[PDB]
Amino acid sequence: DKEFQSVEEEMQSTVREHRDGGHAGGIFNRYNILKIQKVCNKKLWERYTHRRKEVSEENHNHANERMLFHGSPFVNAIIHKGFDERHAYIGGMFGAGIYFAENSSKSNQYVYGIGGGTGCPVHKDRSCYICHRQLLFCRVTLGKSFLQFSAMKMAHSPPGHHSVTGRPSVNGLALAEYVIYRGEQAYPEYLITYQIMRPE
Ligand SMILES: O=C(c1cc(Cc2n[nH]c(=O)c3ccccc23)ccc1F)N1CCN(C(=O)C2CC2)CC1
Ligand SMILES: [Zn+2]
Numbered sequence: 001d002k003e004f005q006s007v008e009e010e011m012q013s014t015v016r017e018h019r020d021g022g023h024a025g026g027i028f029n030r031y032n033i034l035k036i037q038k039v040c041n042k043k044l045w046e047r048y049t050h051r052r053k054e055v056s057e058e059n060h061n062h063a064n065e066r067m068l069f070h071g072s073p074f075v076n077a078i079i080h081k082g083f084d085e086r087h088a089y090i091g092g093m094f095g096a097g098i099y100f101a102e103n104s105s106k107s108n109q110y111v112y113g114i115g116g117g118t119g120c121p122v123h124k125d126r127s128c129y130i131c132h133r134q135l136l137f138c139r140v141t142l143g144k145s146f147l148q149f150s151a152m153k154m155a156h157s158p159p160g161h162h163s164v165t166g167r168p169s170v171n172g173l174a175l176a177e178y179v180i181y182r183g184e185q186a187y188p189e190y191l192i193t194y195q196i197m198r199p200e
Helices: 002-013 042-057 075-081 104-108
Strands: 031-038 065-070 098-100 133-141 145-148 163-166 177-180 186-196
Touching: 002 031, 002 104, 002 133, 002 186, 042 133, 042 186, 065 098, 065 104, 065 186, 075 133, 075 186, 104 133, 133 177
Parallel strands: 145 163
Antiparallel strands: 031 186, 065 133, 098 177, 133 186, 163 177
């Protein structure tokens, strides 16, 4: 499957060297991709496309849809129930929203919790090369995205906007991040099962 090869390439090619020296997500340059599953949840897809059409109509017939990563210990609840802003990241740089990265390694830092939590459930290792990790590769409707550089605790998107784009800056973000404030503005399209690999 070329669809799956495209997802593996997005995963591999978006890895970056993290400022924390791998404290949160581990030390690696690449992954061992074990499985890529397409999520087909008709109810979630209908909620997503219904919202995507509304946002498109409010944004000059353009949804501004992107494929983005999301790492979380709650990936299995997300696949069944969808992203839920009632469980949004309050402590987040851009307030109470649902957060995504365009770099797979940034999302990998959240797979076991904030700052990688205590790592894998079995070895309590944030850099575990044994335990199988899971990330989501999502369809996200950004619509009219508010470009922001510094911390801005929002409860909802700014007036006239459908999302917030956190752009990198000198005394700010190392890498981009994308925030939606409505769970129906993202669809968890692919569930990726993988391992981070020990460097060569
Ligand atoms: O957006 C968050 C969230 C994000 C984060 C940070 C984060 N988590 N994952 C990322 O991939 C990421 C990428 C760039 C910047 C930050 C992140 C932390 C706690 C959170 F609750 N959600 C929590 C998990 N979600 C749910 O619907 C849970 C299942 C009930 C979706 C929304
Ligand atoms: Zn482990």
